[model samples]
Target: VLQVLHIPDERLRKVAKPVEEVNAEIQRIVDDMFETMYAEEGIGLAATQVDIHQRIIVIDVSENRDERLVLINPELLEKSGETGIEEGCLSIPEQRALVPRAEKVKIRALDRDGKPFELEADGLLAICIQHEMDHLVGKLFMDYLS
Candidate 1:
């Protein structure tokens, strides 16, 4: 099911706090997120986009386009290079913006199994990760444009 995303929602303006514990509720939310993302055909999503202020995100940029990744309490450690890309959000429908973003990033987050993991991403994956991370920090790409 595609959740109704609140655009410019005041809640999205607040930075999400990290999840102290990954319980069943968190896992359930992750599952719901995947369902929601796939339903919307979105490449990535953040908790804040769904009016949930938690440090969580989901992404799917599979080469086979079959694998999905759910990231909990994601921390973006490093970002480098730059690219001007057109991006859109589920929250802000019918809107796309040309924004500058890092071409690569190093991120740390937990997997669905509550295991710690780190990743280095570039290209579309890198942009998607940074875009979703920005949502966690209460920042929309438009904020950077202005």
Candidate 2:
């Protein structure tokens, strides 16, 4: 299992590079990421959190964990409607924060098969997407707190 890097770890501060080629290797990493996230009971995770330093995110906002969503080299296209939700990260264990984030968002990303797709999300899914995307940019929800 991949280890999640926590705060105070310089690796978490490092910006991730985009996945130039979405190949089988990237898909394998995505598989491991999902495993690690589920093991940690996390709804979402980014490759950066696992010290992979690649623009990849895995999220499953379903209560039954049936919605296995992957976003590789994701780009946030638009964010509208604001909301604040109490959030926690697998990396930042035992800590929770009410993070302000857009309640709705649009993102474009590549699938595991290297297919381009766009997602429009609201509620928990939207929050999770934004949260994980932040990791790719070397950011934490706690950083938004004052």
Candidate 3:
């Protein structure tokens, strides 16, 4: 598993670049990222946290851990409503804060196989996606704290 970068690591603040291609290397990163997330007991992870400045995020909000999602080069389509939820970050560690987020979101993203798809989500899934998306753009949940 790749070592997840902690807060204050300059790499975590760098905005991720769009994935140019979905090849074996990208797939390999996705696999290792999932491994790292599970080992870390995190529900979501972004490639930026692993020092890979590419638009990739892995998420599994399922209690059974059977649902795995890979979003590469994700684009936010729509966000509606508002919700403030307590959130913690793998990068930040040992800190949780109330973060404002859209209650629902629709996004377009490339799957692990390079297939493009759109997903609409709410509740924990939406919060997870928005949180990870913030990582792609060099933002953390605490940054939203007042």
Candidate 4:
């Protein structure tokens, strides 16, 4: 796991650039991000959290910590329904809140090897996906907190 930026860090609010290319360097970054996340005991992370301005995010929502989902240049294609999720963010430690989000989301993105892929996700996965994607555009769950 890499260093996660905390609240009020200017870097956390900066927008990430699209993945221009899929190469060894980006792949290494992806691996590192996962390592960072797991090390931090987080289920998800964005490149922005580590101060990298790239449109990449890694998430492992599996109860067994076996599924690692990587999204490069992810785009939200659709979302429906709504739900209130009790959420916590690594960047904002010791803080938890009930955040409202789309109950389901269909997304398009590039995999780590740079292959295009599409996915439909709901439940915790959907919330995690949206949360990480928010970082790509310089957004935070706190923005939605009341």
Candidate 5:
């Protein structure tokens, strides 16, 4: 509930630019993204949702909320299969809808420190990654709703 850029906010539809590098500035944004997400009880968020037009995402699926995952300037390598799942977003607030997402995905992204890495993900992790990336490219889950 902490002032996330919601739909109809022009900022939310603008494609995010690559993070030139991950420094203290980028880390601070990631930190605030998590803070906002946690404050809003969200599992994932894109920097664009906060009106930060940089390619970044934060997610923590752990029930204990100790594990935090960060992805910066991510590129989707491959996606396959599909499943329908109920997903929600802080920007959309209080609305959960069925959306189709790849069952698995491979991606390349930077860690919090500008380190390069490729990640293979499945299940909720894969879906969440793709979902957040969509936000980076100016798409939203509601777009897929029927």
Candidate 6:
């Protein structure tokens, strides 16, 4: 498992490059990400946040919250409504903020096995997806407020 790079890591602030295809290397990275997330007790993780500059993220609100989700090359198609919710990030450990985010969102992406798919999510899942996606573009939750 790759260790999650904390905030202060310049890597987390840089945009991730898109992966041309999901190959064995990408799959291995996903597996490592899951192990890292579970080890850190984090529900979501992004490649950039772990110092890997690749478009990928993993989420598991599962622990009594929601099911596990892995998104590759995820793109936000739409977001609606609005809610002010407290948010935190593994990159910015111990720092939390009340950020305004869409109450619901539609995302298009590929599954862990590289199958195309889409999902509509709301509440925490919605926020989590958006947050992780931002990492792909070098944006962090703090940027929303700062």
Taking all chains together, each candidate's TM-score versus the true structure is 0.87, 0.93, 0.92, 0.92, 0.90, 0.88
**Model 5 accuracy (lDDT, Cα):** 0.79
Score candidate 1 by lDDT. 0.75
Model 3 lDDT per residue over 29-135, tens place: 88888898888867888888988888888888887769887888779998877775676768887777678877888998887778788998887778788888888
Best by TM-score: 2
Cα lDDT tens digits for candidate 2, 1-146 = 79788885655767888865688778888888888988886788888888877888899888776899899977989888988678687777577877888889998898786888888889778888888887788787668763
- Cα lDDT computed for each candidate against the true fold: 0.75, 0.82, 0.81, 0.80, 0.79, 0.76
Per-residue alpha-carbon lDDT of candidate 4 for residues 31-146, written as tens digits (9 for 90 to 100): 88888988876677888888888887888988776898888877899897787578786776577867877788888988778888888888778888788877678777778873
Judge candidate 6 against the unseen true structure and give its global Cα lDDT, from 0 to 1. 0.76
Comparison by TM-score, 1 against 3, better one: 3
Candidate 5 similarity to native, TM-score:
0.90
Q: Residue 52 in model 5: shift from native, Å? A: 1.1
Relative to the unseen true structure, what is the Cα RMSD of model 3? Answer: 1.5
lDDT of 6 by residue, 34-117 (tens): 888777756778888777888778888877535767888888898887865676767776768677777788888876667777
lDDT of 1 by residue, 23-108 (tens): 66777787777788767756888888777878777888885548677789777888777865576766765668767878988888
Question: How many clashing pairs per prediction, in order?
Answer: 0, 0, 0, 3, 0, 0
Candidate 1 local Cα displacement, residue 44, angstroms: 0.4
Window of ten residues with lowest summed lDDT in model 2: 5-14
* TM-score, predicted candidate 4 vs. hidden true structure: 0.92
Name the candidate, 2 or 4, with the larger TM-score value: 2
Which residue runs does candidate 1 get wrong by more than 4 Å? Answer: 63-65
Q: Tell me the TM-score of model 1.
A: 0.87
lDDT of 5 at 127: 79
Clashing pairs in 5: none
Best by lDDT: 2
- Ten residues in a row with the worst lDDT in model 4? 19-28
Instruction: Report how far off residue 136 is in candidate 3 (Å).
Output: 0.8
- The ten-residue window of minimal lDDT in model 6 covers 18-27
Model 2 TM: 0.93
Q: What are the per-residue Cα lDDT tens digits for candidate 5 across 71-93?
A: 88778898877865687877775
- Of 4 and 6, the candidate ranking higher by TM-score: 4
